[PDB]
Structures are given as C-alpha cells and as structure tokens.
Design a protein around this ligand. Structure first.
Ligand code: HEM
Ligand code: HEM
Lengths: 141, 140
C-alpha cells in the first residue's frame, strides 16, 4: 500500500524530469532496506541483476549524509561502488533525501535524463517537492 | 501537523518559482468545504494584515472546489464566477489553478513575464498538486 504511493511519486518524478530511470529506497534506522521501488527496468533484467540494492556507493553517501546530489557521471564519484552485473549503465544522476524534519527515511533518485544532458536546477527543486510528499507518507506508515 | 505544513509550503514555493508566478497559494478543505489549511507566497505580512480575513474559497477558487478541473485564465477577474478581490488584496490577472486530489486547490497568479501560464506550466503544477494530495491523504 505504501509502496503503491511511493511508486506513484517515482513515476511522477521520472516523467517530469524526463529521466530514463527512477527509484526510491526507504530504510530503517540501521539503514536496512525496507522498501525499494523503481521504474524504467523490465522484469527480466531485474531477475538477471538478481539482488536488491543494499544502499551502498553513491546511494550510501545520500543515506549517510542526506543532501541533494547531482552528478554528470555517477560512476566518477569517489563514493561510487560500481554497478552489479546486468544492471543498466547509468551516467547522469539526481538524488534527494526522503525525509521529515526529525528524520531521514530514504532517497529518491533519477538517472540518464533523456535529452543526454545533466539534470537541471529546476529538476532538483521539482524532485525535492515530490520527495517531501513521500516523506509524509513514510512517516505516517 | 508541522511536517505536512512544511511540505505544503515547499510545494507552493516550488510551484511559484518553477512557473515564475508572482503569487502562489494552496487551500485545503474537508468534504464539508471548511478551510483546513491556507498556505501562500508573494505577499508580505503588512499586506496580509491589511487584507484581514482569510479566504473562504469563493469566486473562481470556489468553482475549482465544487468542480475540480484545471483552470487557466488570462484574466481571473473577467471570469463570470469571479467575486472580486477584497480591499487591500493585490489585484491579480493571469491565473492557473488545479485541484489537489479532491482535498483542495493549488493556484498561481501573475506570471512575471506578463504572459498567460503555459501548457507545461499546467502540467508541472498539476503534478505538484498530486504530490500535495498524497501528503494530505497520508496526514495526519
Ligand atoms: C530503475 C532505477 C534504478 C536506478 C536509478 C538505479 C541507480 C543506481 C545507482 C546510482 C547505483 C550506485 C552506483 C555506484 O555507486 O557506483 C546503483 C547500484 C546498485 N543497484 Fe541500482 N538502480 C536502479 C534499479 C535497480 C534494481 C531494479 C536493482 C535490483 C533489483 C538494483 C540493484 C542495485 C545494486 C545491487 C547496486 C549495488 C550497490 C548496492 O547494493 O546498493 N538497481 N543503482
Ligand atoms: C499570495 C497568493 C494569493 C493568491 C494567488 C490569491 C488569489 C486570489 C484570487 C484570484 C481571488 C479572486 C477570486 C475571484 O475573484 O473569484 C482571491 C480572493 C480572495 N482572497 Fe486571495 N490570493 C492570495 C493571497 C491571499 C491572502 C494572503 C489573503 C488573506 C490574508 C487572501 C484573501 C482573499 C479573500 C478574503 C478573497 C475573497 C474570496 C474568498 O473568500 O475566497 N488572499 N484570491
């Protein structure tokens, strides 16, 4: 039920900022993954990847210190861990925390803006707003 | 609900800045149409004090509440449902309003280039309103 809500927010973000891929992870205070929702990857590829993210690399960075982050090439970030086998290669990156004041619960993130360009300042503002709505949904589950 | 309040203010702020509106507001109501939340941007405290009473959601805003559908207007005061601005309320012309869904209305006025709001503006603002709907629906 919560996941369907989170899935709508991802869908809205992905569509509005013209991203090829979008996802949201929600974690407990031990930073164990509770929910993982996404758009842009089909089921056969998901099976081939074979395991859910644990929130490492750049996502781990966002989980460690929740702050908006935009990168031209996520794989060049020093915190990058690299993609697992069969995971689509992704380059441009936009990530923002899913939170309320007292607490950060997760990360909403988008990759590979379909115009081949980096995500914009407006993209970031837009996704922060949708993330805030998601934060309310999570804090109230 | 501080958290909800903060989210609705961020959503109004994002809508207002993203479509370059001079003014932005959101009203939230129950099914009896009493005002639960009213959030706004672009008017200073001194002017708010002069206006005095909060909107009851009448005129064109009332229309959006009764029949929830996006509405873009070149001149809000020329709409036949228009009730007019109260004393000391800034006059406003161009208008973009969309239902928050329906729990309310997100609306913007006076795009700063003087032009009507665009199709893209409407799409952007309806998405933000949908987000506000989620925030409200998952409140308190
Ligand atoms: C569809 C939207 C998706 C996006 C935008 C996305 C994005 C990313 C990013 C940015 C990284 C970090 C790369 C780095 O730090 O070098 C990553 C890693 C990873 N991804 Fe995805 N991914 C998506 C889908 C998926 C899916 C569907 C799965 C599995 C079911 C998955 C599993 C993983 C795993 C296992 C890692 C390794 C790090 C970790 O375990 O957290 N991803 N992804
Ligand atoms: C800052 C963003 C604001 C916007 C975009 C906005 C927009 C509008 C518009 C377009 C109308 C005319 C409706 C019609 O003629 O049918 C209206 C009416 C009205 N406004 Fe505002 N307004 C804003 C702020 C405020 C504030 C701060 C107050 C009071 C403190 C206020 C109080 C009222 C009242 C009392 C009415 C008469 C109708 C009603 O009660 O709903 N407005 N508003």
């Amino acid at each position: 039920d919560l996941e369907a809500t989170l899935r709508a927010i991802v869908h809205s973000a992905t569509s509005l900022v013209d991203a090829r891929y979008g996802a949201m992870e929600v974690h407990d205070r031990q930073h164990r993954v509770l929910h993982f929702v996404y758009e842009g990857i089909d089921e056969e590829t998901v099976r081939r990847i074979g395991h859910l993210p644990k929130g490492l690399g750049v996502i781990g960075l966002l989980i460690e210190d929740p702050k908006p982050l935009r990168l031209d090439d996520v794989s060049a970030h020093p915190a990058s861990i690299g993609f697992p086998p069969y995971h689509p290669p992704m380059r441009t990156f936009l990530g923002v925390p899913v939170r309320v004041r007292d607490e950060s619960f997760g990360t909403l993130y988008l990759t590979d803006k379909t115009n081949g360009q980096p995500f914009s300042d407006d993209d970031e503002v837009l996704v922060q707003a949708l993330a805030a709505a998601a934060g309310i949904a999570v804090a109230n589950a």
